[PDB]
Amino acid sequence: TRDANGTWEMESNENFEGWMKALDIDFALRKIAVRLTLTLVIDQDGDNFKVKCTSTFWNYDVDFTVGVEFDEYTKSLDNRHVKALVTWEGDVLVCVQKGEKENRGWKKWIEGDKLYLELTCGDQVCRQVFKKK
Numbered sequence: 001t002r003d004a005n006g007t008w009e010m011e012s013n014e015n016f017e018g019w020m021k022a023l024d025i026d027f028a029l030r031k032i033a034v035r036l037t038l039t040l041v042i043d044q045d046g047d048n049f050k051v052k053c054t055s056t057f058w059n060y061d062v063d064f065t066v067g068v069e070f071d072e073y074t075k076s077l078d079n080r081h082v083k084a085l086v087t088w089e090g091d092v093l094v095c096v097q098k099g100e101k102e103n104r105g106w107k108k109w110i111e112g113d114k115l116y117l118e119l120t121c122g123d124q125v126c127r128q129v130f131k132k133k
């Protein structure tokens with residue numbers, strides 16, 4: 001449950017629009033993003049991660065080392081500077097992005113061939129479920 005390697009295909013996506021709105025993403029682009037198929041590609045070696053979420057139009061890419069703070073510029077999302085930090089809380093992978101938005105980050109629970117992802121921003125939570133291909 002601590003191995004997130006793989007290609008992960010979306011099966012569930014709840015409150016995607018509320019989470020994007022909390023990040024101030026443009027209403028027009030939110031309209032397009034809600035239609036796109038999302039694929040999550042994770043390369044994990046020890047504490048080193050490369051995470052890629054891909055669609056037709058926009059990709060989101062981030063590389064990090066567990067336990068090492070990094071400057072993140074969310075250039076393909078809301079275009080903000082955050083201080084990001086990914087850690088293990090038991091078997092949960094937790095990211096906190098310190099910056100303008102409060103309660104901003106994400107959490108991953110890996111349960112066999114299922115991956116549960118919760119994206120948070122302010123009072124909004126987006127809940128996604130993926131299956132390993």
Ligand SMILES: *C/C=C(C)/C=C/C=C(C)/C=C/C1=C(C)CCCC1(C)C
Nearest residue numbers: 033038053054055058059060077106
């Ligand atoms: C562990 C996995 C994480 C943190 C994945 C996060 C995914 C995103 C921030 C993706 C956001 C996207 C949008 C802004 C809309 C269009 C395409 C996406 C899925 C890349």
